[PDB]
Amino acid sequence: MYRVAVIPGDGIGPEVIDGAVRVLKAVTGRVRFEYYEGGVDVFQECGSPIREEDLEEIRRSDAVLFGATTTPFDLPGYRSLILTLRKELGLYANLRIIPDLRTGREIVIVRENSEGLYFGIGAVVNGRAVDVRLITREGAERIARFAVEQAKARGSFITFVHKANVLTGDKFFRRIVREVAGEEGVEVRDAIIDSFTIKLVRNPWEHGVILSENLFGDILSDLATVHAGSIGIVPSGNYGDGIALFEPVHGSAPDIAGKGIANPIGAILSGAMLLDYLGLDGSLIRAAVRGYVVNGELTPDMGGRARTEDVVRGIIGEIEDLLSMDEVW
Amino acid sequence: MYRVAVIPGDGIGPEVIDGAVRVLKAVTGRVRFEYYEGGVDVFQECGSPIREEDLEEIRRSDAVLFGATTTPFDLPGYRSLILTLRKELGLYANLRIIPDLRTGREIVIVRENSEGLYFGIGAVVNGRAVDVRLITREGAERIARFAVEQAKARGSFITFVHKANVLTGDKFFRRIVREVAGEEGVEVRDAIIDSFTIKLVRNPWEHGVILSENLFGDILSDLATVHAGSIGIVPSGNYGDGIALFEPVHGSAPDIAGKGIANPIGAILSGAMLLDYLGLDGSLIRAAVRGYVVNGELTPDMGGRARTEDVVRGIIGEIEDLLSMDEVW
């Protein structure tokens, strides 16, 4: 059996993760689920958003499934759970795939996930505050290589988005992405971060494998969800050299917490990416979702009257009708 | 007479500036125009994109009117003309106003223009490159004050866009904007930079006076031009304590250089903001533009068959019919 750590978190996190796990429990029985708490409640007990001993289990699990976590702005001392996990598990590649769920079309973003303006060097002294945007050869190379493999796997190219006209680190980053992509025969198109926002809303689907620094990727990936109906359909994988974590891009949405209306598709499809990463069958979850979308009613954030549970039951439905036959058929 | 330095630059810069100056020459004769060269040609002669002696004139002029400038990525040693001028003239406030030119509606952005990731501290050493995002008390305060005056003047509020969940400097910046806006009774709404891209495309007009760090402002302001028809209608002012510079947000577009199709409205309306700054009548240029838009044919970038000259002649037209009467009437 494969060993998967599950971190529902809070707000709507438990809701959409209930959905994604049930869907996973319906395409395979080769996965054992271990649940851990995390977020403010755990901070207030222990001074950390995750317990040291739990973190020790989690780093030895085969993969991680993560919901969402509320990070209150006005709580001093508190590190975001997800940033902690990203750093603790060496997760340097954030892959966000924004689907138009009528057509087959995708926006594919590779967000560097370990450095940039997230590297953690910051300070205030005497009315002068700084944050240090760090790009390292090793950081550049390995996210470049990750990106070329997503290009190749798709017979595509890389759009490297940057501000190398202003940022020394983006000049450096650019050399290295061109070097690795050349060494491997992949085309790299330049894009500048400000004008690329325009290209990204007007012309969504012509950009290949988009690659950028950590914070730029953060920004572009939220923006790209204008093209799916809602940020709530969009999944991600955070990959490192020995483990990966999967979470929906959406947040913990405590407004609609417990109202039973949250969109589980982001979590579900993030479950798909987790099966892929384990060498199991994510395609089934994807196909099950495309099929349910055709006629199925959606959640309010997408515009329908449907409850979370109707979407979940409906997709399991389509899955059951796929496992009813062999891989062939 | 008022003394205005003019820097057409290159590509379509001369074209759209010809238009904006003629329009200015048609609403007032109280302004003398002095022309200076700038950009790569001047770099190659002198090693600078602007001559020292010309810069000395320009810093003593009453205001600056600037077109656009090509900054080739593959030319070593070259500082962008506009970044140079921004820094040399102490221009710390970048105000970009994106109009929907049917309705009266505007997106109003105050981009901090002297620090942030533009402050200029960057280096590469041993496969480690950095850029330092600097926020200073003095930088925060004065862009905060500039922003409250745009709020008050409109009976509005500030939306402060940031990533203070990750960036120490944005935490600092936030304190200071809240302090000055409170001290002056202006509401400040928080917005986070990634989710604000979504709000900015779906819900453009409900954000008041948007304020952010330098690079965030760069990014948001290009994005906000999806709501005007084209980046080519959008003007800006770069303001400092003793001088200001006005330029269209668009770039030098060397593709359509000399084809006679470039949209002059961004430059023209930037001329409007320059008359305002001199205590002359920008409103006339604005009204002249709203009137010409109703039925007038536009340039290809907006979708019409019209040439640059037809737009320019047309707006002068509407201006002439405004100066035909007194201020009253």
Ligand SMILES: CC(C)[C@H](C(=O)O)[C@@H](O)C(=O)O
């Ligand atoms: C919550 C925040 C720290 C996180 C990030 O900034 O990466 C989130 O916005 C996301 O995009 O995953």
Ligand SMILES: CC(C)[C@H](C(=O)O)[C@@H](O)C(=O)O
């Ligand atoms: C050309 C570039 C240096 C400039 C900037 O980044 O500020 C431009 O993109 C703009 O927005 O004015």
Ligand SMILES: [Mn+2]
């Ligand atoms: Mn984000």
Ligand SMILES: [Mn+2]
């Ligand atoms: Mn820009």
